[PDB]
Amino acid sequence: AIGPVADLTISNGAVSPDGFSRQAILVNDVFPSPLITGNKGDRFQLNVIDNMTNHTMLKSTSIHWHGFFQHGTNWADGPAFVNQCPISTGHAFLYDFQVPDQAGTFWYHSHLSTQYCDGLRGPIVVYDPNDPHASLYDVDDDSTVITLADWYHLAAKVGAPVPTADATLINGLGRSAATLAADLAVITVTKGKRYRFRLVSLSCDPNYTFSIDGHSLTVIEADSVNLKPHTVDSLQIFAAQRYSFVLNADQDVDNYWIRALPNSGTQNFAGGTNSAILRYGAAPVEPTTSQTPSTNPLVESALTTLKGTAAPGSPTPGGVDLALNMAFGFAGGNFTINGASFTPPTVPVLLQILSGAQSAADLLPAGSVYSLPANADIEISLPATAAAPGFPHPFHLHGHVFAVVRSAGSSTYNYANPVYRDVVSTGAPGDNVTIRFRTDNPGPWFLHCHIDFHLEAGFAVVMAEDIPDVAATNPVPQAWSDLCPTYDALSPDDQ
Ligand SMILES: *[C@@H]1O[C@H](CO)[C@@H](O[C@@H]2O[C@H](CO)[C@@H](O)[C@H](O)[C@H]2NC(C)=O)[C@H](O)[C@H]1NC(C)=O
Ligand SMILES: *[C@@H]1O[C@H](CO)[C@@H](O[C@@H]2O[C@H](CO)[C@@H](O)[C@H](O)[C@H]2NC(C)=O)[C@H](O)[C@H]1NC(C)=O
Ligand SMILES: OC[C@H]1O[C@@H](O)[C@@H](O)[C@@H](O)[C@@H]1O
Ligand SMILES: [Cu+2]
Ligand SMILES: [Cu+2]
Ligand SMILES: [Cu+2]
């Protein structure tokens, strides 16, 4: 509804998405954060005005525009102390980037510590006027965006270091155990019409098993990548993933439960928990529909891209320029990858590079940075392990889409027409989720666990892609160059 040129004013205030009042983060004076829209190829100019006054939730901020490649604008990507120093309170900062060659469903969120769980997270849609799937539906608009989120009665820094959610919010509304009368979200449809629903996980932690009673879902886009249509009766969506699906409103006029079962916390629907309403003329009451067993669940390995794009490289293990293996571990309240835990360096990784760092051994933090050759194919395997609790861990690679040559719960490799996405579950112990991508994008890019409570615990690495070309490819605006001095002048209590 706003965008692609717009102000985003960040402030604190009370919210009660589940009928419980708590302090949170507001964006343009609303919770949940508003939807931003634009079209394929557009210039986005989003002026993030930081007016937050609460240090427990951090007065500083940084926004990541999730899914966008940010080619030439690595400075605008969002990660605190990788791509910028945070915006300090009482200051504004403009993210000015372009979206060539990308269309689909995205989201924005704070990429500073675990701040996005406190409410700074909203959907984004980039419309394609020549969408390959335009003819599959009649309605695609603001009312067809569906967001899922985890919600906590105690703030990120206040509750447990890995808290259990009190509520699942669908379009920013849901019920908790003790607010079973709280307003549910209503998604309205007219019989005979076909809907492009755009489902985005704003989750800080849980994955949801998503279904709609009595309806099938035709999946046509995954993480901003066009798919071949693939009809399922349920899907597991992980933190930060998006799916577009077509729903044909061809059932009896009625109310139907929209369901989102989290993999932890309250794992049922008693009293309308973890649920929203699909309303056809139907009575303005709750659904009384029954969940039938899922007989045709989404399987990631059975998805493919619309074009049938092959994976980069030659169809064999290690058949690439550089293959890397990320071994997960956990020691001392810290997650590790190849023995190293991520602690945000004081000089942002991009700034280190611009300032003359030439290699990964130069780059801080030590052991957390990987140099990547220019214009190459890369293969990364992320084998799951019990040695890193709270699996399955979804990983996200910034500045890039990747081929999922191997998925969780699959034994097979697919080099010929694998799905392409940007957030992938690494699965349960025994899996070896494996991805490949092209180094077509000079700059430092976070690769990390998108469960945010684990990202605090350092479950992250940085891909330092084409170091020699980072400065030339990524000219930075003077406002970017003023972020660090301004942030370093702040006292800890104002951070
Ligand atoms: C700033 O935000 C924090 C974190 O949300 C608020 O923390 C609350 O602290 C009170 C009083 O100590 C507790 O009873 C609440 O349970 C906390 N809320 C949450 C969500 O954890 C704090 O109130 C905020 N500061 C101001 C001035 O509003
Ligand atoms: C997960 O997959 C990776 C990549 O195939 C495996 O790493 C390779 O292991 C073989 C045999 O030990 C070696 O030839 C290579 O050096 C490894 N490739 C690297 C490091 O890039 C890894 O062992 C697999 N893990 C599990 C648990 O199956
Ligand atoms: O920090 C949480 C605190 O919040 C207060 O409002 C009360 O609910 C206390 O029981 C609790 O200790
Ligand atoms: Cu993200
Ligand atoms: Cu994790
Ligand atoms: Cu990230």
Automatic annotation (TrEMBL):
Keyword annotations for this protein, in alphabetical order, are:
Copper, Disulfide bond, Glycoprotein, Lignin degradation, Metal-binding, Oxidoreductase, Repeat, Secreted, Signal
| E.C. numbers | 1.10.3.2
Cysteine disulfide partners in this protein = C85-C484, C117-C204
Query: Which residues hold Cu(2+) 4?
Result: H393, C449, H454
One GO molecular-function annotation for this sequence? Answer: copper ion binding
Domain Plastocyanin-like: from-to ranges: 11-130, 143-282, 343-466
Membrane-spanning intervals of the chain = none
InterPro entries per the record?
Answer: Cu-oxidase-like_N, Cu-oxidase_2nd, Cu-oxidase_C, Cu-oxidase_fam, Cu_oxidase_CS, Cupredoxin
What GO cellular component term, any one, is given?
Answer: extracellular region
The record's subcellular location field reads:
Secreted
Name the chain's protein: laccase
Biological source species: Coriolopsis gallica
The lineage, from the top, is: Eukaryota, Fungi, Dikarya, Basidiomycota, Agaricomycotina
